[PDB]
Design a protein around this nucleic acid. Structure first.
Lengths: 150, 25, 91, 97, 129, 140, 80
RNA sequence: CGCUGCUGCAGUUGAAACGCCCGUAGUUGGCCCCCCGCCGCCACGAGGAAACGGGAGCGCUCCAGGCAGGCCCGUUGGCCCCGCCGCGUGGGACCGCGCAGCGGGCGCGGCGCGCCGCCGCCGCAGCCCCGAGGAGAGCGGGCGGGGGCACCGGUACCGGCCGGGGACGGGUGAAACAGGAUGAUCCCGCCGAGACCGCCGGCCGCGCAGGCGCCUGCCAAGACCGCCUCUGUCAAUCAAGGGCGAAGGCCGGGGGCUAGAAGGCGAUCAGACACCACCGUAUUCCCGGCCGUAAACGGUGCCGCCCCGCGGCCGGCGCGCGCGUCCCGCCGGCCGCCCAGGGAAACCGGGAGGCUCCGGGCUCUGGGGGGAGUAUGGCCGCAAGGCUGAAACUUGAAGGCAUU
RNA sequence: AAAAUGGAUAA
């Protein structure tokens, strides 16, 4: 069931059946929307903001308390990461494996994990390219991964 | 092993065939 | 391009003569001398072999003794690893 | 036909097991197809039960006991009678006798 | 990937009615699986149905009066010629007299009898008996 | 699994049967065309031949008998085939260097029953029917 | 007991997995903690897997856990 | 002849899931958004050569025939078929493909409409489905003979010692060859070497398989679970291609203890050049290469979903009890018995069940038994060989599970 | 510890 392993697990997060704003003690919409943007200037990633309101504030799903998803609220203020968060997170991990491999060409299990981690990047970027989230010129290169990362 | 011995016998015939071809080529 | 289909690239000078196996070692012990290596002090890949064992950073201009065909030879990256531990043992 | 479902080995989820040798034959059978019956016995034969302790100077000394696992091969075991050829009905039952 | 919602869902209905299972559960629901069930309930092969609108995949409830034999889907959904609807009937129907093959026609989801009354043809969705 | 259960998998489905179909032995002998070349009779119902020498082939070990046969040389493709002179006492009529007609044994070229090495029959000797010279209707 | 899937006993849905329920949804909820200066509600994520900090303090109110997040100070049940 | 399997094949053992993974062609794909275009489609048409197939009538004397015939419809000789992915009219279910603001006026746009405009004109609710028991991610929490690199102990075995010290010592089925008064075997204190990680070691665990078990240190990695985190169909399965793949082999360095292909040797018998001893090279070990095979096995492809009780283990993860490493379990696995049910049966039953009452998707592979993985044509490989892969020709059985 | 063999053809 996992894209790159024979694992069929179902560990999933949940959203409420009644889709209505938090009656525990929710904040003003413009204020929460500004608050998410304020935390993104400090560099907080989109998953981390959704998590921060869930523990720090009053609701895990920003869409019910606000009007829309964490990245649409951030996008209007231009805070949508230029490379979509999903691609970037995997690209970060691939470089760290490349570093471990640089010292020793002996590790084989790690080479299997690179030929798997980077396979997903080519597939997800390809989805982003047609969707226009990623420009057509952009393409992942293993040698140039660090340069793309920064 | 009886079928593997047959496979070994074939491989030797196949190998003798390649040396014989070389002599006549 | 594809000047040499096989890896007989560097050994394409010897030509038809010499033998397959005899040219085969040369492709690894001649690719070694020609290739640049990293200056330990400058971290730039400019070190080449001035003469057997004499190796000079073309950019750094330092000179470091090294294995005859590679700046860092296999038996010595073991011995250096040994002398680092053994010095620490005293202190 | 499949005489037994375990197929003659206890290898489950691994695909490999470490291999040992028959105490007798010296045939190499993977740990899963191995008799392995634990042995604990008095070092002198119980025939010299207390004849040794009466001879022993030191007070309250107990006869040493060996605690060794004996690992035999399937072929060696049936011919040394460590386990017999059971009936089709008898094979499923475990319950170490 | 759950390639067909209807096939698994129809196998599950049939599975419950062999174990009796008066109350049956369908987990992934599509409009077609509702249209098949109203056709079945109207026929009376199944007593009634409902769907709990959880705000995700909408699970389906199925009530069977217990009088059901085999209910399967025909996919690949071959469109059938109006003239030869019967050839598919010969293979999938227990007796020309009883049984139902639900087809999809422009006028709307229609059974085998309605199709030949209108002399119309459609893609076979499934057989319920 | 026949699978390929796709509305748009007719191309795959058409070829999969065409490729696998040749595997069936009867179809493969039938349309490969290897036999249309191999058949000494060339696929003809019968073919003319010249008698080369009468031969005796012992029958299979369960049935011990000396079958009597004639080696004939096909006129069309100069193939040396072995035909079985049929019935009883037929060999006396057959002569060496004599024209002969040869036809299949009816198993589709395979040997029929216990005759080792024989796949064809002698319908006519020197034009006159073998059966006729045996039923007496037409003699030598 | 002629209960049918249409109305399952509340405890059954509460016992089963939060996706295998006739009505699927959140297992977790908001549980309060007590802080200096507070006898009122201080809600926090019940299953916090990240650090929450004492309001206007340096110390962290909830210990990190894969499951429901544990605490080192006085705490208040669910919503009050 | 469901012996070709679209209807409608078989692949656990009869013949046959490629060792596995990655993956582009293809091929296949959740749910949802009545009410319009382009499809595919659905129905009906029109127009497409008769013969021919059928088909209405008509006694060639029957008939196979024929368009005849009779005081007859303008007497006949019709009629349905050329299938036709062509071309029209209709209808919108399923099924795909639709980025993009709408609007009024000026426009009766030089016989009526249009286009490209032209603006704010305040008209329109202007414009974020949902969050798959699909995934891709995020954090936390533990889990593990999962991988690399070092660091690294322990005995055993073998070789060299020193102090004995006193005779045969191995070796086997019984022996024999070797070792010994050059003091053997035996002990005990060493010393050198390389392998190996015992017992714990398992209906244990982990890995994509092959496989994986000394000590610490070190990096990167992985499922699973928890989850009021994040996107938002990114999915499935695979040609071609890319990686990995026990053992043995092989190439270039090294090593070198023990076993030990070959080789010698003893006994062994008719002969054993076999089995059992004894000696031993390659090999085993290591680092960089090739090779590409296995009874690579669960002889069971890959995702998907429902499916009956009793269980054991294992990893998280909860709720009550007294409060325990309890009890009920919730999920991911590892397994034993098995209710249906299936099958020729052995028997699978967490499928080999939900099939002749046959149709979720993708891929491979077989078609009586030999010849035959043979020949040749490639291609890959240093080779050894691997992958693809014949035919002529033969034969009646070969073969599965059972019962006596 | 040492033990190899048994024509064909029907019964």
């Amino acid at each position: 069931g996992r894209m790159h392993s024979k694992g069929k697990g179902i560990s999933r997060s949940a959203i409420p059946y009644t889709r209505a704003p938090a009656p525990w003690n929710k904040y003003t919409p413009e204020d929460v929307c500004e608050q998410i943007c304020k935390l993104a200037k400090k560099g907080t990633p989109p998953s981390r903001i959704g998590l921060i309101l869930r523990d720090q504030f009053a609701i895990g799903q920003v869409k019910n308390v606000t009007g829309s998803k964490i990245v649409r609220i951030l996008k209007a203020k231009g805070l949508a990461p230029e490379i979509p968060e999903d691609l970037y997170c995997m690209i970060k991990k691939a470089v760290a494996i490349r570093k471990h491999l640089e010292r020793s060409r002996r590790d084989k299990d790690s080479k299997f994990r690179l030929i798997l981690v980077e396979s997903r990047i080519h597939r997800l970027a390809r989805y982003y390219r047609q969707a226009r989230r990623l420009p057509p010129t952009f393409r992942y290169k293993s040698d140039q991964a660090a340069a793309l990362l920064a | 092993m009886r079928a593997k011995w047959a496979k070994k016998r074939m491989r030797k015939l196949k190998r003798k065939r390649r040396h014989m071809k070389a002599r006549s080529k | 391009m594809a000047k040499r289909t096989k890896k007989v690239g560097l050994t394409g000078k010897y030509g038809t003569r010499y033998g397959r196996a005899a040219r085969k070692q040369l492709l690894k012990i001649e690719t070694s001398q020609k290739a640049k290596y990293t200056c330990p002090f400058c971290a730039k890949d400019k070190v080449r072999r001035t003469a057997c064992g004499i190796w000079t950073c073309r950019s750094c201009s330092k000179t470091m003794a090294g294995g005859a065909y590679s700046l860092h030879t296999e038996p010595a990256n073991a011995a250096r690893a040994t002398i680092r531990r053994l010095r620490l043992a005293r202190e | 036909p499949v005489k037994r479902r375990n197929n003659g080995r206890s290898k489950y989820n691994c695909g490999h097991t470490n291999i040992v040798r028959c105490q007798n034959c010296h045939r190499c059978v993977p740990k899963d197809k191995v008799i392995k019956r634990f042995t604990i016995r008095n070092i002198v034969d119980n025939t010299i039960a207390d004849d040794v302790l009466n001879a022993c100077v030191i007070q309250g000394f107990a006869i040493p006991k060996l605690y060794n696992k004996v690992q035999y091969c399937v072929s060696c075991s049936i011919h040394n009678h460590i386990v017999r050829v059971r009936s089709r009905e008898d094979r499923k039952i475990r319950t170490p006798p | 990937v759950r390639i067909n919602v209807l096939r698994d869902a129809l196998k599950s209905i049939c599975n419950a009615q062999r174990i009796g299972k008066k109350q049956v559960i369908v987990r992934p629901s599509s409009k077609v699986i509702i249209e098949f069930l109203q056709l079945m309930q109207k026929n009376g092969y199944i007593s009634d149905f409902a769907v709990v609108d959880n705000h995700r995949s909408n699970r389906i409830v199925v009530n069977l009066i217990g009088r059901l034999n085999k209910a399967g889907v025909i996919s690949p959904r071959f469109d059938i010629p109006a003239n030869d609807i019967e050839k598919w009937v010969v293979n999938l129907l227990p007796s020309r007299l009883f049984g139902h093959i639900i087809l999809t026609t422009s006028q709307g989801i229609m059974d085998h009898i309605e199709a030949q009354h209108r002399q119309i043809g459609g893609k076979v969705i499934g057989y319920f008996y | 699994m026949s699978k390929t259960s796709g509305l748009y998998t007719a191309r795959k489905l058409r070829t999969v049967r065409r490729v696998n179909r040749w595997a069936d032995k009867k179809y493969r002998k039938a349309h490969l065309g290897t036999w249309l070349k191999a058949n000494p009779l060339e696929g003809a119902c019968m073919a003319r031949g010249i008698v080369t020498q009468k031969i005796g082939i012992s029958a299979k070990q369960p049935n011990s008998a000396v079958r009597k046969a004639v080696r004939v040389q096909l006129t069309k493709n100069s193939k040396k085939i072995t035909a079985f002179v049929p019935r009883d006492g037929s060999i006396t009529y057959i002569d060496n260097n004599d024209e002969v007609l040869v036809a299949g044994f009816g198993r589709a070229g395979r040997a029929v029953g216990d005759i080792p090495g024989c796949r064809f029959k002698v319908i006519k000797v020197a034009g006159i029917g073998l059966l006729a010279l045996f039923l007496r209707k037409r003699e030598k | 007991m002629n209960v049918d899937l249409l109305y399952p006993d509340p405890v059954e849905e509460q016992r089963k997995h939060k996706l295998k329920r006739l009505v699927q949804g959140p297992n977790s909820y908001f549980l309060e903690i007590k802080c200096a200066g507070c006898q009122d509600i201080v809600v926090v994520y019940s299953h916090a897997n990240t650090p929450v900090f004492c309001p206007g303090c340096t110390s962290q109110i909830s210990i990190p856990t894969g499951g429901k997040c544990a605490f080192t100070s006085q705490v208040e049940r669910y919503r009050q």
